[PDB]
PDB file of C-alpha atoms and ligand atoms in Angstrom:
ATOM      1  CA  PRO A   1       0.048   0.042  -0.017  1.00 49.87           C
ATOM      2  CA  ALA A   2       1.361   3.488  -1.078  1.00 52.04           C
ATOM      3  CA  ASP A   3       1.886   5.879   1.765  1.00 52.91           C
ATOM      4  CA  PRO A   4       4.004   8.870   0.111  1.00 50.10           C
ATOM      5  CA  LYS A   5       4.344  10.998   3.305  1.00 50.04           C
ATOM      6  CA  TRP A   6       6.571   8.245   4.887  1.00 52.63           C
ATOM      7  CA  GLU A   7       8.133   7.073   1.643  1.00 52.84           C
ATOM      8  CA  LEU A   8      12.003   7.419   1.219  1.00 55.69           C
ATOM      9  CA  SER A   9      13.651   6.794  -2.204  1.00 54.52           C
ATOM     10  CA  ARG A  10      15.897   3.849  -2.411  1.00 54.33           C
ATOM     11  CA  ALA A  11      18.420   5.929  -4.445  1.00 53.50           C
ATOM     12  CA  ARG A  12      18.811   8.182  -1.254  1.00 55.97           C
ATOM     13  CA  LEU A  13      19.646   5.314   0.984  1.00 54.43           C
ATOM     14  CA  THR A  14      23.211   3.534   1.292  1.00 55.32           C
ATOM     15  CA  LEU A  15      22.944   0.392   3.605  1.00 56.42           C
ATOM     16  CA  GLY A  16      26.040   0.075   5.742  1.00 58.11           C
ATOM     17  CA  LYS A  17      27.196  -2.566   8.424  1.00 57.28           C
ATOM     18  CA  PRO A  18      24.965  -4.964  10.546  1.00 56.44           C
ATOM     19  CA  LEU A  19      24.223  -3.880  14.245  1.00 53.26           C
ATOM     20  CA  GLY A  20      24.796  -7.269  16.232  1.00 50.65           C
ATOM     21  CA  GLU A  21      22.440  -9.925  16.363  1.00 54.11           C
ATOM     22  CA  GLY A  22      18.952 -11.311  17.966  1.00 55.88           C
ATOM     23  CA  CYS A  23      17.436  -8.760  20.189  1.00 55.93           C
ATOM     24  CA  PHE A  24      15.688  -5.889  17.696  1.00 55.22           C
ATOM     25  CA  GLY A  25      15.834  -8.391  14.706  1.00 52.98           C
ATOM     26  CA  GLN A  26      17.837  -7.931  11.545  1.00 52.38           C
ATOM     27  CA  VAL A  27      18.972  -4.420  12.037  1.00 57.86           C
ATOM     28  CA  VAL A  28      21.709  -2.448   9.745  1.00 58.33           C
ATOM     29  CA  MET A  29      23.065   1.146   9.933  1.00 56.19           C
ATOM     30  CA  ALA A  30      22.902   3.368   6.965  1.00 54.51           C
ATOM     31  CA  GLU A  31      23.296   6.759   5.483  1.00 56.67           C
ATOM     32  CA  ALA A  32      20.033   8.406   4.291  1.00 56.32           C
ATOM     33  CA  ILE A  33      19.962  11.722   2.494  1.00 54.82           C
ATOM     34  CA  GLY A  34      16.786  14.099   2.430  1.00 57.35           C
ATOM     35  CA  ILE A  35      14.810  12.482   5.191  1.00 53.60           C
ATOM     36  CA  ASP A  36      13.226  15.574   5.955  1.00 55.40           C
ATOM     37  CA  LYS A  37      12.146  16.488   2.450  1.00 56.05           C
ATOM     38  CA  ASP A  38      12.573  20.544   3.202  1.00 55.92           C
ATOM     39  CA  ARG A  39      16.114  20.029   4.092  1.00 55.96           C
ATOM     40  CA  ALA A  40      17.584  19.188   0.401  1.00 54.94           C
ATOM     41  CA  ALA A  41      20.398  16.494   0.600  1.00 53.60           C
ATOM     42  CA  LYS A  42      21.149  16.895   4.318  1.00 55.11           C
ATOM     43  CA  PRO A  43      22.752  13.587   5.541  1.00 53.15           C
ATOM     44  CA  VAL A  44      21.383  11.542   8.138  1.00 50.53           C
ATOM     45  CA  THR A  45      22.803   8.388   9.989  1.00 52.26           C
ATOM     46  CA  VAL A  46      19.807   5.720  10.451  1.00 54.34           C
ATOM     47  CA  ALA A  47      19.076   2.172  11.525  1.00 55.44           C
ATOM     48  CA  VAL A  48      17.222   0.040   9.098  1.00 58.53           C
ATOM     49  CA  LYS A  49      15.205  -3.128   9.827  1.00 56.37           C
ATOM     50  CA  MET A  50      14.502  -5.665   7.317  1.00 53.82           C
ATOM     51  CA  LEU A  51      13.407  -9.269   6.778  1.00 55.49           C
ATOM     52  CA  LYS A  52      15.714 -12.360   7.004  1.00 57.28           C
ATOM     53  CA  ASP A  53      16.458 -14.103   3.891  1.00 57.08           C
ATOM     54  CA  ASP A  54      14.320 -17.110   4.582  1.00 56.70           C
ATOM     55  CA  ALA A  55      11.261 -14.803   5.980  1.00 55.87           C
ATOM     56  CA  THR A  56       7.538 -16.118   5.599  1.00 58.83           C
ATOM     57  CA  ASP A  57       4.572 -14.158   4.791  1.00 56.92           C
ATOM     58  CA  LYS A  58       3.756 -13.708   8.499  1.00 55.84           C
ATOM     59  CA  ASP A  59       7.060 -11.987   8.891  1.00 59.39           C
ATOM     60  CA  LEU A  60       6.446  -9.390   6.384  1.00 57.17           C
ATOM     61  CA  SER A  61       2.955  -8.796   7.825  1.00 58.44           C
ATOM     62  CA  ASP A  62       4.628  -8.568  11.320  1.00 60.14           C
ATOM     63  CA  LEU A  63       7.140  -5.877  10.137  1.00 64.34           C
ATOM     64  CA  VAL A  64       4.528  -3.989   8.300  1.00 64.83           C
ATOM     65  CA  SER A  65       2.122  -3.865  11.344  1.00 65.16           C
ATOM     66  CA  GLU A  66       5.102  -2.808  13.597  1.00 62.27           C
ATOM     67  CA  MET A  67       5.727  -0.097  11.140  1.00 61.77           C
ATOM     68  CA  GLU A  68       2.105   0.680  11.087  1.00 60.18           C
ATOM     69  CA  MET A  69       2.137   0.919  15.006  1.00 62.50           C
ATOM     70  CA  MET A  70       4.892   3.267  14.745  1.00 60.45           C
ATOM     71  CA  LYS A  71       3.216   5.699  12.428  1.00 59.53           C
ATOM     72  CA  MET A  72      -0.033   5.450  14.843  1.00 57.57           C
ATOM     73  CA  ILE A  73       1.889   6.129  18.061  1.00 60.45           C
ATOM     74  CA  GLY A  74       3.265   9.372  16.827  1.00 58.61           C
ATOM     75  CA  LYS A  75       6.702  10.772  17.627  1.00 56.34           C
ATOM     76  CA  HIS A  76       8.379  11.765  20.827  1.00 59.47           C
ATOM     77  CA  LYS A  77      12.222  12.745  21.488  1.00 58.83           C
ATOM     78  CA  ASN A  78      12.561   9.830  24.127  1.00 59.45           C
ATOM     79  CA  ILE A  79      11.328   6.975  21.972  1.00 59.92           C
ATOM     80  CA  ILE A  80      12.866   5.542  18.950  1.00 60.27           C
ATOM     81  CA  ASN A  81      11.162   7.141  16.183  1.00 61.21           C
ATOM     82  CA  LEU A  82      10.162   6.065  12.625  1.00 59.22           C
ATOM     83  CA  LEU A  83      11.878   8.291  10.049  1.00 56.73           C
ATOM     84  CA  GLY A  84      10.372   6.521   6.876  1.00 55.99           C
ATOM     85  CA  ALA A  85      10.398   3.378   4.879  1.00 55.53           C
ATOM     86  CA  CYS A  86      11.334   1.868   1.354  1.00 56.50           C
ATOM     87  CA  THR A  87       7.843  -0.084   0.331  1.00 55.96           C
ATOM     88  CA  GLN A  88       8.173   0.234  -3.299  1.00 59.32           C
ATOM     89  CA  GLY A  89      10.434  -1.403  -5.837  1.00 60.21           C
ATOM     90  CA  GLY A  90      12.522  -3.671  -3.592  1.00 59.42           C
ATOM     91  CA  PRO A  91      12.579  -5.449  -0.256  1.00 56.14           C
ATOM     92  CA  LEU A  92      11.054  -3.623   2.852  1.00 54.87           C
ATOM     93  CA  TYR A  93      13.227  -1.276   4.840  1.00 54.25           C
ATOM     94  CA  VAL A  94      11.807   0.493   7.954  1.00 55.20           C
ATOM     95  CA  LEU A  95      14.082   3.484   8.682  1.00 55.08           C
ATOM     96  CA  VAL A  96      14.204   4.325  12.567  1.00 51.65           C
ATOM     97  CA  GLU A  97      16.527   6.976  14.503  1.00 51.10           C
ATOM     98  CA  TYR A  98      20.284   5.683  15.086  1.00 50.57           C
ATOM     99  CA  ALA A  99      21.403   5.583  18.436  1.00 51.46           C
ATOM    100  CA  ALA A 100      25.454   5.283  18.343  1.00 53.72           C
ATOM    101  CA  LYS A 101      26.037   4.563  22.275  1.00 58.31           C
ATOM    102  CA  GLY A 102      24.234   1.542  22.238  1.00 60.35           C
ATOM    103  CA  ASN A 103      21.471   0.295  24.876  1.00 61.78           C
ATOM    104  CA  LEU A 104      21.420   2.124  27.995  1.00 63.50           C
ATOM    105  CA  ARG A 105      22.692  -0.968  30.435  1.00 63.46           C
ATOM    106  CA  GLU A 106      25.930  -1.035  28.427  1.00 61.33           C
ATOM    107  CA  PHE A 107      26.245   3.011  28.046  1.00 60.99           C
ATOM    108  CA  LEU A 108      25.969   2.887  31.833  1.00 64.79           C
ATOM    109  CA  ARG A 109      28.534   0.059  32.820  1.00 66.14           C
ATOM    110  CA  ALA A 110      31.184   1.512  30.239  1.00 62.93           C
ATOM    111  CA  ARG A 111      30.999   5.081  32.151  1.00 61.17           C
ATOM    112  CA  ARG A 112      31.452   3.970  35.722  1.00 58.77           C
ATOM    113  CA  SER A 113      34.930   5.139  35.503  1.00 61.59           C
ATOM    114  CA  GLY A 114      37.220   7.271  33.093  1.00 60.52           C
ATOM    115  CA  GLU A 115      36.893  10.835  31.636  1.00 60.15           C
ATOM    116  CA  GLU A 116      33.249   9.748  30.664  1.00 57.77           C
ATOM    117  CA  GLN A 117      32.232   8.863  34.022  1.00 57.85           C
ATOM    118  CA  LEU A 118      28.527   9.689  34.587  1.00 59.74           C
ATOM    119  CA  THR A 119      27.635  12.353  37.164  1.00 58.53           C
ATOM    120  CA  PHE A 120      24.827  11.861  39.671  1.00 61.27           C
ATOM    121  CA  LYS A 121      22.921  14.675  37.700  1.00 58.48           C
ATOM    122  CA  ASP A 122      23.670  12.833  34.201  1.00 62.91           C
ATOM    123  CA  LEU A 123      21.961   9.865  36.075  1.00 62.26           C
ATOM    124  CA  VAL A 124      18.934  11.766  36.950  1.00 62.78           C
ATOM    125  CA  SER A 125      18.655  13.285  33.532  1.00 68.40           C
ATOM    126  CA  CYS A 126      18.548   9.574  32.127  1.00 69.85           C
ATOM    127  CA  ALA A 127      15.723   8.809  34.577  1.00 71.09           C
ATOM    128  CA  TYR A 128      13.973  11.909  33.695  1.00 66.59           C
ATOM    129  CA  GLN A 129      13.994  11.262  29.893  1.00 64.81           C
ATOM    130  CA  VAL A 130      13.022   7.799  30.248  1.00 68.36           C
ATOM    131  CA  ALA A 131      10.161   9.004  32.190  1.00 70.08           C
ATOM    132  CA  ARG A 132       9.140  11.479  29.629  1.00 70.15           C
ATOM    133  CA  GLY A 133       9.046   8.937  27.166  1.00 68.95           C
ATOM    134  CA  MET A 134       6.981   6.421  29.099  1.00 70.09           C
ATOM    135  CA  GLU A 135       4.701   9.567  29.967  1.00 68.65           C
ATOM    136  CA  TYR A 136       4.141   9.662  26.251  1.00 64.16           C
ATOM    137  CA  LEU A 137       3.598   6.027  25.517  1.00 63.05           C
ATOM    138  CA  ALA A 138       1.257   5.888  28.525  1.00 61.40           C
ATOM    139  CA  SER A 139      -0.634   8.876  26.908  1.00 59.25           C
ATOM    140  CA  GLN A 140      -1.062   6.936  23.726  1.00 58.62           C
ATOM    141  CA  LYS A 141      -2.433   3.871  25.432  1.00 57.39           C
ATOM    142  CA  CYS A 142       0.794   1.775  24.743  1.00 56.86           C
ATOM    143  CA  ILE A 143       2.012  -0.632  27.211  1.00 54.46           C
ATOM    144  CA  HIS A 144       5.706  -1.435  26.900  1.00 53.97           C
ATOM    145  CA  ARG A 145       5.548  -4.873  28.927  1.00 54.37           C
ATOM    146  CA  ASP A 146       9.406  -5.186  28.783  1.00 53.15           C
ATOM    147  CA  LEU A 147      10.597  -1.783  30.190  1.00 52.99           C
ATOM    148  CA  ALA A 148      14.355  -2.332  31.273  1.00 54.51           C
ATOM    149  CA  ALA A 149      17.803  -0.299  30.753  1.00 55.12           C
ATOM    150  CA  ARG A 150      18.502  -3.099  27.863  1.00 54.96           C
ATOM    151  CA  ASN A 151      15.448  -1.666  25.940  1.00 53.60           C
ATOM    152  CA  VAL A 152      16.630   2.112  26.201  1.00 55.13           C
ATOM    153  CA  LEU A 153      18.936   3.192  23.439  1.00 56.95           C
ATOM    154  CA  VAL A 154      21.307   6.318  23.692  1.00 55.43           C
ATOM    155  CA  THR A 155      22.233   8.708  20.796  1.00 57.93           C
ATOM    156  CA  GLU A 156      25.580  10.424  20.206  1.00 59.98           C
ATOM    157  CA  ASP A 157      23.793  13.615  22.129  1.00 55.98           C
ATOM    158  CA  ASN A 158      23.071  10.972  25.216  1.00 57.75           C
ATOM    159  CA  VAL A 159      19.470  11.305  24.299  1.00 59.49           C
ATOM    160  CA  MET A 160      17.459   8.423  26.029  1.00 57.16           C
ATOM    161  CA  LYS A 161      15.148   6.620  23.632  1.00 54.55           C
ATOM    162  CA  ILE A 162      12.760   3.949  24.633  1.00 55.36           C
ATOM    163  CA  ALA A 163      12.951   0.987  22.194  1.00 57.05           C
ATOM    164  CA  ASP A 164      11.055  -2.402  21.736  1.00 57.12           C
ATOM    165  CA  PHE A 165       7.628  -0.613  22.064  1.00 59.83           C
ATOM    166  CA  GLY A 166       4.907  -1.395  19.365  1.00 62.76           C
ATOM    167  CA  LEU A 167       5.604  -4.946  19.105  1.00 63.77           C
ATOM    168  CA  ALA A 168       3.804  -5.242  22.706  1.00 64.47           C
ATOM    169  CA  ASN A 169      -1.109 -19.929  24.651  1.00 65.59           C
ATOM    170  CA  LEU A 170       1.347 -19.354  27.628  1.00 66.52           C
ATOM    171  CA  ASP A 171       0.174 -22.289  29.155  1.00 64.90           C
ATOM    172  CA  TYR A 172       1.859 -24.820  26.786  1.00 66.99           C
ATOM    173  CA  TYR A 173       5.457 -24.955  26.317  1.00 66.90           C
ATOM    174  CA  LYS A 174       6.325 -24.396  22.508  1.00 70.25           C
ATOM    175  CA  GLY A 175      14.227 -14.204  25.557  1.00 68.32           C
ATOM    176  CA  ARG A 176      13.076 -15.579  28.698  1.00 67.82           C
ATOM    177  CA  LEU A 177      10.277 -13.975  30.813  1.00 69.96           C
ATOM    178  CA  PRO A 178      11.838 -10.901  32.256  1.00 72.16           C
ATOM    179  CA  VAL A 179      10.699 -11.807  36.015  1.00 73.31           C
ATOM    180  CA  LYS A 180      13.107  -9.709  37.921  1.00 74.88           C
ATOM    181  CA  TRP A 181      11.467  -6.424  36.006  1.00 74.09           C
ATOM    182  CA  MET A 182       7.786  -7.481  36.622  1.00 74.96           C
ATOM    183  CA  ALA A 183       5.214  -6.294  39.225  1.00 80.84           C
ATOM    184  CA  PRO A 184       4.066  -8.875  41.514  1.00 79.74           C
ATOM    185  CA  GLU A 185       0.406  -8.994  39.704  1.00 78.78           C
ATOM    186  CA  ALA A 186       2.220  -9.367  36.463  1.00 78.38           C
ATOM    187  CA  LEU A 187       4.246 -12.141  37.730  1.00 78.53           C
ATOM    188  CA  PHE A 188       1.067 -13.671  39.050  1.00 77.02           C
ATOM    189  CA  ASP A 189      -1.455 -13.199  36.329  1.00 77.50           C
ATOM    190  CA  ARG A 190       0.860 -12.620  33.220  1.00 79.33           C
ATOM    191  CA  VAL A 191      -1.189  -9.541  32.416  1.00 79.80           C
ATOM    192  CA  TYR A 192       0.410  -6.193  32.064  1.00 78.70           C
ATOM    193  CA  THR A 193      -0.761  -2.658  32.425  1.00 78.21           C
ATOM    194  CA  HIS A 194       0.437   1.167  32.659  1.00 77.65           C
ATOM    195  CA  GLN A 195       0.786   0.240  36.541  1.00 80.66           C
ATOM    196  CA  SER A 196       3.036  -2.694  35.957  1.00 79.82           C
ATOM    197  CA  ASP A 197       5.099  -0.618  33.626  1.00 79.58           C
ATOM    198  CA  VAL A 198       5.609   2.026  36.303  1.00 81.71           C
ATOM    199  CA  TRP A 199       7.023  -1.125  38.581  1.00 80.83           C
ATOM    200  CA  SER A 200       9.233  -1.842  35.668  1.00 80.76           C
ATOM    201  CA  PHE A 201      10.594   1.675  35.733  1.00 80.00           C
ATOM    202  CA  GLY A 202      11.276   1.626  39.244  1.00 80.05           C
ATOM    203  CA  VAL A 203      13.404  -1.499  38.530  1.00 80.81           C
ATOM    204  CA  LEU A 204      14.994   0.701  35.580  1.00 80.06           C
ATOM    205  CA  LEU A 205      15.737   3.661  38.145  1.00 79.36           C
ATOM    206  CA  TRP A 206      17.582   0.918  40.423  1.00 80.47           C
ATOM    207  CA  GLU A 207      19.610  -0.077  37.061  1.00 80.30           C
ATOM    208  CA  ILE A 208      20.548   3.665  36.381  1.00 82.95           C
ATOM    209  CA  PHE A 209      21.652   4.351  39.934  1.00 81.17           C
ATOM    210  CA  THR A 210      23.697   1.182  40.173  1.00 79.65           C
ATOM    211  CA  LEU A 211      25.048   2.073  36.775  1.00 78.53           C
ATOM    212  CA  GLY A 212      23.881  -1.112  35.067  1.00 80.61           C
ATOM    213  CA  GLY A 213      23.676  -3.600  38.379  1.00 82.15           C
ATOM    214  CA  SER A 214      21.772  -6.725  38.097  1.00 79.00           C
ATOM    215  CA  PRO A 215      18.436  -6.783  39.813  1.00 80.54           C
ATOM    216  CA  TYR A 216      17.880  -8.584  43.325  1.00 81.30           C
ATOM    217  CA  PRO A 217      21.399  -9.844  43.580  1.00 79.05           C
ATOM    218  CA  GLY A 218      21.503 -13.382  45.079  1.00 77.71           C
ATOM    219  CA  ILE A 219      17.971 -14.228  45.128  1.00 76.90           C
ATOM    220  CA  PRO A 220      16.850 -17.446  43.369  1.00 77.86           C
ATOM    221  CA  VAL A 221      13.612 -17.121  41.141  1.00 78.91           C
ATOM    222  CA  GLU A 222      11.813 -19.515  43.245  1.00 84.07           C
ATOM    223  CA  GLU A 223      11.867 -17.140  46.086  1.00 84.55           C
ATOM    224  CA  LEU A 224      11.190 -13.852  44.233  1.00 89.75           C
ATOM    225  CA  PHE A 225       7.411 -14.060  44.247  1.00 91.35           C
ATOM    226  CA  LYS A 226       6.926 -14.707  47.729  1.00 88.77           C
ATOM    227  CA  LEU A 227       9.601 -12.182  48.856  1.00 84.93           C
ATOM    228  CA  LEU A 228       8.257  -9.283  46.909  1.00 85.09           C
ATOM    229  CA  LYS A 229       4.501 -10.088  48.304  1.00 84.97           C
ATOM    230  CA  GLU A 230       6.009 -10.094  51.812  1.00 84.08           C
ATOM    231  CA  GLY A 231       7.328  -6.601  51.093  1.00 82.90           C
ATOM    232  CA  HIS A 232      10.980  -7.464  50.244  1.00 80.65           C
ATOM    233  CA  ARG A 233      12.358  -4.704  47.961  1.00 79.49           C
ATOM    234  CA  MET A 234      15.862  -3.832  46.800  1.00 77.49           C
ATOM    235  CA  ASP A 235      18.038  -1.566  49.026  1.00 77.21           C
ATOM    236  CA  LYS A 236      19.049   1.821  47.994  1.00 77.77           C
ATOM    237  CA  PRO A 237      22.084   1.734  45.798  1.00 76.44           C
ATOM    238  CA  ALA A 238      25.234   3.439  47.174  1.00 73.54           C
ATOM    239  CA  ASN A 239      25.409   7.162  46.240  1.00 76.55           C
ATOM    240  CA  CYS A 240      21.581   7.340  45.655  1.00 76.29           C
ATOM    241  CA  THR A 241      19.706  10.031  47.587  1.00 76.39           C
ATOM    242  CA  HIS A 242      16.810   9.351  49.827  1.00 76.56           C
ATOM    243  CA  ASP A 243      14.368  11.310  47.558  1.00 74.28           C
ATOM    244  CA  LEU A 244      15.358   8.899  44.382  1.00 73.00           C
ATOM    245  CA  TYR A 245      15.079   5.908  46.539  1.00 73.21           C
ATOM    246  CA  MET A 246      11.646   7.024  47.675  1.00 76.18           C
ATOM    247  CA  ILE A 247      10.577   7.370  44.082  1.00 79.28           C
ATOM    248  CA  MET A 248      11.968   3.636  43.542  1.00 78.36           C
ATOM    249  CA  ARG A 249      10.210   2.480  46.441  1.00 80.19           C
ATOM    250  CA  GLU A 250       6.854   4.395  45.319  1.00 78.61           C
ATOM    251  CA  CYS A 251       7.042   2.411  41.730  1.00 77.13           C
ATOM    252  CA  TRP A 252       7.254  -0.619  43.712  1.00 76.54           C
ATOM    253  CA  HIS A 253       3.851  -0.315  45.794  1.00 77.90           C
ATOM    254  CA  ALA A 254       2.067  -3.487  46.406  1.00 79.32           C
ATOM    255  CA  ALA A 255      -1.127  -1.979  45.150  1.00 80.31           C
ATOM    256  CA  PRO A 256      -0.875  -0.917  41.586  1.00 80.21           C
ATOM    257  CA  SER A 257      -3.428   1.948  42.258  1.00 82.94           C
ATOM    258  CA  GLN A 258      -1.288   3.467  44.810  1.00 83.14           C
ATOM    259  CA  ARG A 259       2.002   3.554  42.400  1.00 81.80           C
ATOM    260  CA  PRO A 260       2.642   7.097  40.818  1.00 79.33           C
ATOM    261  CA  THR A 261       1.446   7.793  37.078  1.00 77.61           C
ATOM    262  CA  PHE A 262       4.358   8.598  34.519  1.00 77.23           C
ATOM    263  CA  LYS A 263       3.269  11.992  34.372  1.00 75.90           C
ATOM    264  CA  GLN A 264       3.796  12.317  38.346  1.00 72.20           C
ATOM    265  CA  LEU A 265       7.295  10.378  37.802  1.00 70.12           C
ATOM    266  CA  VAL A 266       8.312  13.175  35.531  1.00 75.35           C
ATOM    267  CA  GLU A 267       7.242  16.063  37.902  1.00 75.54           C
ATOM    268  CA  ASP A 268       9.009  13.876  40.787  1.00 78.37           C
ATOM    269  CA  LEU A 269      12.284  13.518  38.683  1.00 81.26           C
ATOM    270  CA  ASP A 270      12.157  17.158  37.657  1.00 79.94           C
ATOM    271  CA  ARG A 271      11.996  18.107  41.434  1.00 77.65           C
ATOM    272  CA  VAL A 272      15.008  15.862  42.148  1.00 79.42           C
ATOM    273  CA  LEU A 273      17.042  17.451  39.360  1.00 80.45           C
ATOM    274  CA  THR A 274      16.486  20.907  40.943  1.00 81.78           C
ATOM    275  CA  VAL A 275      17.209  19.760  44.341  1.00 84.15           C
ATOM    276  CA  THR A 276      20.553  17.818  42.968  1.00 85.19           C
ATOM    277  CA  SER A 277      21.826  21.009  41.651  1.00 85.37           C
ATOM    278  CA  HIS A 278      21.645  22.572  45.166  1.00 86.41           C
ATOM    279  CA  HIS A 279      23.349  19.731  47.131  1.00 83.07           C
ATOM    280  CA  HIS A 280      26.707  19.064  45.328  1.00 80.54           C
TER     281      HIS A 280
HETATM  282  C1  LIG B   1      19.795  -5.683  20.455  1.00 80.99           C
HETATM  283  C2  LIG B   1      21.001  -5.331  20.904  1.00 80.99           C
HETATM  284  C3  LIG B   1      22.136  -5.141  19.767  1.00 80.99           C
HETATM  285  O1  LIG B   1      22.262  -5.885  18.846  1.00 80.99           O
HETATM  286  N1  LIG B   1      22.712  -3.765  19.434  1.00 80.99           N
HETATM  287  C4  LIG B   1      22.724  -3.117  18.608  1.00 80.99           C
HETATM  288  C5  LIG B   1      22.325  -1.692  19.070  1.00 80.99           C
HETATM  289  N2  LIG B   1      21.187  -0.808  18.256  1.00 80.99           N
HETATM  290  N3  LIG B   1      20.070  -1.413  18.058  1.00 80.99           N
HETATM  291  C6  LIG B   1      19.262  -0.606  17.464  1.00 80.99           C
HETATM  292  C7  LIG B   1      18.033  -0.702  17.315  1.00 80.99           C
HETATM  293  C8  LIG B   1      16.759  -0.817  17.125  1.00 80.99           C
HETATM  294  C9  LIG B   1      15.322  -0.774  16.808  1.00 80.99           C
HETATM  295  C10 LIG B   1      14.452  -0.562  17.955  1.00 80.99           C
HETATM  296  C11 LIG B   1      13.150  -0.652  17.760  1.00 80.99           C
HETATM  297  N4  LIG B   1      11.999  -0.451  18.892  1.00 80.99           N
HETATM  298  C12 LIG B   1      10.903  -0.728  18.091  1.00 80.99           C
HETATM  299  N5  LIG B   1      11.152  -0.844  16.728  1.00 80.99           N
HETATM  300  C13 LIG B   1      10.209  -1.354  15.701  1.00 80.99           C
HETATM  301  C14 LIG B   1       8.759  -1.413  16.297  1.00 80.99           C
HETATM  302  C15 LIG B   1       9.768  -2.357  15.173  1.00 80.99           C
HETATM  303  C16 LIG B   1      12.584  -0.997  16.403  1.00 80.99           C
HETATM  304  C17 LIG B   1      13.359  -0.993  15.201  1.00 80.99           C
HETATM  305  C18 LIG B   1      14.866  -1.011  15.532  1.00 80.99           C
HETATM  306 CL1  LIG B   1      15.683  -1.153  14.132  1.00 80.99          CL
HETATM  307  C19 LIG B   1      19.855   0.478  17.315  1.00 80.99           C
HETATM  308  C20 LIG B   1      19.482   1.723  16.692  1.00 80.99           C
HETATM  309  N6  LIG B   1      18.237   1.977  16.468  1.00 80.99           N
HETATM  310  O2  LIG B   1      20.470   2.802  16.508  1.00 80.99           O
HETATM  311  C21 LIG B   1      21.066   0.400  17.861  1.00 80.99           C
HETATM  312  N7  LIG B   1      22.467   1.291  17.686  1.00 80.99           N
HETATM  313  C22 LIG B   1      23.600   0.834  18.127  1.00 80.99           C
HETATM  314  C23 LIG B   1      21.928  -1.871  20.379  1.00 80.99           C
HETATM  315  C24 LIG B   1      22.759  -3.076  20.724  1.00 80.99           C
HETATM  316  C25 LIG B   1      23.994  -2.579  21.313  1.00 80.99           C
HETATM  317  O3  LIG B   1      23.675  -2.176  22.627  1.00 80.99           O
HETATM  318  C26 LIG B   1      25.206  -2.131  23.221  1.00 80.99           C
HETATM  319 CL1  LIG B   2       0.779   6.261  33.730  1.00 80.50          CL
END
């Protein structure tokens, strides 16, 4: 189906090197000229998603549905945005924003030391940006279902971009279930809400302030649910302020209705940024 407003000429795309394997599908980096049609030949580095060589008809419909979902959700500075597609005269290419610094977990773990060592204010800024992206997704009735630092990408300009949204019988056996990021009611029922996303955001906050730590260190998966239901929660990360830990703890309220909304989390993290600039 034709959609000129999103179509890019193949002649203006130069496909480049692949970007890793098996987590966001078959992705390659590319140079695209004239994405914005009012900017003449302005060059832009992009990430391209395409089908595998042995792809089935269902795989094509899946990628087309993912593309249509990106068109419907709309644009926001803190999500991986759709820039356009090559749908005519060749294989399907879905162009999205390129994030040079990789996923947030690896970005954090590489900046624990060295000249590019992240400051406390940089970590608060990262959390604020992810909350803004999630506030946007929730406003568009989109539940992420897998919010975690591994699913946030970082641009050359350190902009946080939520990725792995859009795409999203369990009782029969045929990426494992992300149990350590799941709200107790999500673990229990295997149902997701914006409120279970807020719990996941709390775990992501803990990932940010531990600079990529692994949640619930030392807890066997068979003990996790009982402990969370009894009120067990992760301890405050070292160097983390009491206020930020209270935000994490409110994200992890046992009652989904008592957790903050993403709109409230944006406000709370904006407050923490202000108070951080005063205690230094
Ligand atoms: C998975 C990890 C891995 O291989 N790499 C490569 C590196 N990478 N991955 C992406 C991407 C992407 C992406 C994300 C989406 N979320 C939704 N959707 C559409 C609905 C289907 C997409 C599509 C794609 Cl292509 C990028 C990027 N976009 O720039 C990058 N850049 C390096 C991340 C990770 C390495 O991390 C250390
Ligand atoms: Cl919300």
